[PDB]
Amino acid sequence: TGSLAGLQMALKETALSVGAQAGLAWRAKIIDEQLNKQARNLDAIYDFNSLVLEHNILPPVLLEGRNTLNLADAQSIRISDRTYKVAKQAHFITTPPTWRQYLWMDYVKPEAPKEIWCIYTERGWKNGIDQANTILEENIARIKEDFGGMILYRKLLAMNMVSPPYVSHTDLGVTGDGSEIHIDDRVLRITALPELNVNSAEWRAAVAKDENA
Amino acid sequence: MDYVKPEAPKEIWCIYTERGWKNGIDQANTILEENIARIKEDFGGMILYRKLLAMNMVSPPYVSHTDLGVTGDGSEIHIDDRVLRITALPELNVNSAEWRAAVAKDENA
Amino acid sequence: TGSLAGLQMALKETALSVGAQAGLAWRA
Amino acid sequence: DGCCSKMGGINYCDSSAGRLVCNNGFYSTCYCTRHAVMDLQFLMGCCLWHGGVYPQLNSSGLVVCNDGYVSEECSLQK
Amino acid sequence: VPKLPCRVDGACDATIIKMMTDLNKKGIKVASVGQNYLISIPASALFADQSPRLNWASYSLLNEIAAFLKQFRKIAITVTSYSSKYVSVKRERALTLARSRVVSEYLWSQGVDSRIIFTQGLGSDKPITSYTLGGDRSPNARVEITFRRAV
Amino acid sequence: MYVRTNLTILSPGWLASMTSADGTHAYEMQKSPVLLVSWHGKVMQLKVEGL
Amino acid sequence: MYVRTNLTILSPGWLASMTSADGTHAYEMQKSPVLLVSWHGKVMQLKVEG
Amino acid sequence: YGPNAKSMPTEEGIPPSANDLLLHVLEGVPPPGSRRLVVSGGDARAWLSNEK
Amino acid sequence: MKFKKPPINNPSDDATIKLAEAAVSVSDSMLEMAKVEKVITPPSKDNTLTIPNAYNLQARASVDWSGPIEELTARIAKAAHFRFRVLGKSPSVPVLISISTKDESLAEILRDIDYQAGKKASIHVYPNSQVVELRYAKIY
Amino acid sequence: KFKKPPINNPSDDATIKLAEAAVSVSDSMLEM
Amino acid sequence: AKVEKVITPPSKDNTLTIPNAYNLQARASVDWSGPIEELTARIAKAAHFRFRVLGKSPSVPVLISISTKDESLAEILRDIDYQAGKKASIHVYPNSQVVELRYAK
């Protein structure tokens, strides 16, 4: 222990266990209050309603990576310039998504409970606060994933690298028997899902000028 | 070198604790000397390779790369695939008739 | 319970059971 | 203790930089998150620059790292 | 917490305020706009009459400035020297370059933890005052040390 | 769940819907303990107990 | 092209490859009018018509 | 080849590309099933999925 | 000679720090692609042709609305003293809008509603008959 | 005598940046 | 490093120089990773030039990657020429307002 001349606990864990829960619940309440204060700005920012396609179809989610290298083992490497992947596929919706299913944190008030008790209860309090902040940061990453994938889809459709979804509708007339009728039956079905095209000869570039003076 | 602080603990106790102290110091110096030998091995082997490549006694590694275009299906694309693979490893050559010598002059006055 | 400085029955059901019936009959 | 001394006291923790802000407009010298640029040069533990300690419990005192190297240095002597 | 560092080492806010106040009363101008910092030194407190030779007593002032510069964390420092008009353009361009070279060398010899130090001498091209009656006593013969605090 | 109201259901997403002649809506949807509605241009929440 | 040989092909880069038990190789690759090979320590070139 | 040959020939082909989990890692979403690690001293996040 | 630097605001919360950091990246992704889409297909027509202005379309309003289209358009027409008209069948999935402005004219409000309606509905104004007309798309 | 401030004012250096980002996103929506 | 490094003289460097016409100094903003012909045609169309191609397109196309925020078209053309390598070349005629993409035989 140091130099040559220098040579010549249950309440511990119970303190951490009551501090972590109280810190987590308190920080969760404060996070929810900050979310509810700013409710109109988040609706203006994460505007899912104005990204929806023709027949109320949610756009697919696309992901991009750049300047890629893999060292497969010794003796072999593989490199690429860009890669694009379809993470999620398009589908019909009845309602658009909202930010509340991503960002809202869950609160239940915990009502289920001295020399060194105070410092370790305080340390547990700090641990619970830090854990809540980490959870919120992962939620933020998830909502950013969904919005960024849809936004990237719009750009690649404009630059002619994906195909739009193709939809067919069939018109039946007045159908039914004498016990039940439906007046105007129409069945709608999307028959071609969006997909990337590998023919590179039709791809369209976009050059944006600036002009002044 | 790796450190973990040991916190896990009188007529003739002092002299033998002191002798154990000397033994531990000597052992640490020996360990460091073997590490020095190992790093010198790696650097000297690579440096010797450069000299023999210059003096034409080893062959360089030969590498091939293949260019794929835009590959993938409609669910995933990679824009510019290239695969690199070294096909000939370096090796000594036993034909002594192509070996090249190096004579270094000095000139003054 | 709350802040860090903050932390530092049979008659029950018998009462509900006689109240519910009387309220229901009177309102009926 | 005293971070913003001869300033107005602590305003808040800027987590974007990992630093405290004093009540005048100066950045403090104190850190307030662990993802701040601290200049770490000295680290403890053994089997660094290998995989770490392979977590089996041994009858003898040898300590083996995750890539097969054996730490004779953290190993207990006889 | 006991083994992580709790602050950047050797640095204190009271020490920063104390030394900045002492330097401003002594006569060296210390200014801060945003996160950029400027230290401006009159040439009479450092050099002889237009020679690149320091007096022996001005090394205490350079030591004081180095002790100030060790309080921050930074990437680049720029030292620029300016003088007054004496003979031609070339003589004072050479003079200011020599002055900046010597000052930045002593600062680099002391332990300022910067990655780059740039030095230049601009001669008598950029005056900060229209009163040009002094020689080296003029307020517009100076050396300026500028940097940006990083994070 | 089968929900009868004349508000407009926004968030949890429903499976089928019908409307009457005077403007009452009926929804069939999956279970959830909260509903998000628009009243007169204002978004609020309805709370469902008893699940 | 599908190439059957027991030389070692180095430069132009292949698509699928096999080796036999006695050391003969078979390769599938993209088209090129030249091949660079090295037989037992010596580098040479082959020229392909057709 | 009969039941004794002397052995079988050996196959190799195209090396596989980069693992597509890194797209989710780029976005900041942890890979599913992983667990968190604690990183000190700089701005980084880390996860452990398959002893990688 | 106390030293001070000018912006000294109220203290900040780190959740708001993280949301702001996400929002900046969302905003410049949006800006870049809107530039791309503007370059690729240039617009040629404007809805001033379909919604011209008039006297007593110059009363002003400030609005904060998050519902279906018909009620807001009816309120705007009633404030402008115009008759209100609906053409077509309303769809089963409702057409939702979200407007948050301050001090613009009723013609500008109607033009923003018409732009946000998109491919689902349209707004027309006939000033000689004093009629505001909303027509739904022939889809589904 | 008295001139009160707006009740929901972005009086915070993070809230301000959040509100400008919210402005620019909706302007971009209108351009689209 | 001094012995091993090989250089070329600035006289015989085969890279297209800046063609200093007036129309080619406008700033632009490009993100592209794909075939060379369509991007060069778009650059030419933006400069109010004509665009012509001399040669034969190969089976595997020539792929470039340009990602810039503010830059004039002449140097963008210079980067296209540098990245094309030995397989293609770009020539600019500023009297008859034309650019030309030439393939390698």
TrEMBL record, chain A:
UniProt entry keywords in alphabetical sequence: Signal
Domain of life: Bacteria
This protein's name: DotC
Source organism per UniProt: Legionella pneumophila
Positions spanned in the full protein: 28 to 272 of 303
From TrEMBL, chain E:
Superkingdom of origin: Bacteria
Domain OmpA-like: 34-151
A single Gene Ontology CC term: membrane
Assigned keywords, A-Z: Membrane
Membrane recorded as keyword: yes
TM spans (from-to): none
Protein name as annotated: LphA (DotK)
Natural source organism: Legionella pneumophila
Taxonomy of the source species: Bacteria, Pseudomonadati, Pseudomonadota, Gammaproteobacteria, Legionellales
Designated gene of the protein: lphA
Portion of the full-length sequence here: 38 to 188 of 189
From TrEMBL, chain K:
Keyword Signal carried by entry: yes
Keywords on record: Lipoprotein, Signal
Key word Lipoprotein present: yes
Domain of life: Bacteria
Name the UniProt record assigns to this protein: DotD
